Structure 1
Amino acid sequence: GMNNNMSLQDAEWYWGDISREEVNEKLRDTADGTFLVRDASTKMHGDYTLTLRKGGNNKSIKIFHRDGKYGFSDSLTFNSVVELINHYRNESLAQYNPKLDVKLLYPVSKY
């Protein structure tokens, strides 16, 4: 989703065709750290926001195609907004800054 290559906002499960009531139908009663790719509309139409819900603080999360930069950056240089986030999905995102306190459970891939 920027030049002809396609992997960050649209990676493996990263779809964005799920809105407010249809995301809630398989979400916030069970959800304690499940991360899944939600359609927005606010600054016109926002197709690639990501949404994880923790049952308590239920709170969405922005992507962006390849803009974040996390890894050993000399010969192969790193540019990924998920690589900074995935380090703290390995443990607890409240030790980052966002008050979620969650590990990776399971993505809702194509509903």
Structure 2
Amino acid sequence: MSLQDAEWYWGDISREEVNEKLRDTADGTFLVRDASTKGDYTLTLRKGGNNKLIKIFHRDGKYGFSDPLTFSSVVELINHYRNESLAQYNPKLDVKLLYPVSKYQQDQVVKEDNIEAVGKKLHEYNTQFQEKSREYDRLYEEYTRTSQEIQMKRTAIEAFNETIKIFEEQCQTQERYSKEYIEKFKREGNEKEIQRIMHNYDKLKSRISEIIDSRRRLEEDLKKQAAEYREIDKRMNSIKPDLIQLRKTRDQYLMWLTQKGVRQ
């Protein structure tokens, strides 16, 4: 049959469109398109998680991957290797053309024949896409801001921990040096000097209690902000799949509109 009516023939699509149509596909998935030079035919085959390009040369109405060009039509060349392996041609490629990417399923998204109907629907989709795009970009800002402030708070908490260790080292230092002097003043009857040491110790303990409580309040803030990060992260992991599909539906309605209108 004609190559235009064949499903796996896509005409003038780029290597990038093929990559997306073959992204994460199983070995054996294939499609045929025109040459980027624009043999005028390139076969793309999925094998080993890669996209292998196989050029289809054309000499005097004869086709083939290499000369001698045995086949007379790209359809007969494709169907033959759809039923036999590619190892007979090149041993590195040991697979067959099994799963075809059809232009039939691409036409199933758009469900309106009228050009005014596709255009009206395109405007709806493109409107929704910009709405969800601006929504996503706002969530991303909150995501970045929250992630940064969480890192700031955690570093500050590390600083609180080291500060408290230093102030607690002071208490031990004062305890060591005192007692020896506290005992001497007790025999020396200088009770006023005992109170000055005791008062300075109470001044150190209260400052320590305040620093500890500043760290506790910061830890409570970190607990609340960490929960807000998880919620933002969830709301983004949910709109990301929807934004992709919405953009692709928008792009297909653009494709339908271009192919249905005058071209150069």
TM over 0.5: yes
Determine if contact 1:69/1:79 at 8 Å carries over to the other structure.
yes
Inter-CA distance 20–87: structure 2 relative to 1 (3 Å threshold): closer
Q: Deviation string for 1:30-80 (max 9, x for gaps)?
A: 23011212343237xx75322222125531223357968799999999733
The count of aligned residue pairs is 104
User: Where in structure 1 are there 5+ consecutive unaligned residues?
Assistant: 1-5
1:93, distance to aligned residue in structure 2 (A): 0.6
Q: How far apart, CA to CA, are the structure 1 residues paired with 2:92 and 2:70?
A: 30
More helix by share: 2
Which of 26, 30, 53 is matched with 1:35 structurally? 30
Task: Say if 1:88 and 1:96, in contact at 8 Å, map to a contact too.
Answer: no
Q: Which is further off, 18-27 or 66-75? A: 66-75
Provide the residue aligned with 1:11 in structure 2: 6
The worse-fitting range, judged by mean Cα deviation, of 72-81 and 29-38 is: 72-81
With a CA cutoff of 8 Å and minimum separation of 6, indicate the structure with the bigger relative contact order.
1
Q: Counterpart in 1 of 2:237?
A: none
Query: What TM-score, normalized by structure 2, do the two folds share?
Result: 0.29
1:71–1:47: structure 2 CA closer, same or farther, 3 Å change rule? closer
Identity %: 97
Compute the TM-score of the two structures, normalised by the length of structure 1.
0.56
For residues 9-42 of structure 1, give each alpha carbon's deviation from its aligned partner in whole angstroms, at most 9, with x where no partner exists: 7744322232122211221422301121234323
Cα distance in 1 for residues equivalent to 2:57 and 2:65: 21
Give the gaps of 5 or more residues in structure 2: 105-264
Cα distance change of structure 1 residues 65 and 32 upon mapping to structure 2, 3 Å threshold:
same
> How many Å separate the matches in 2 of 1:61 and 1:75?
16
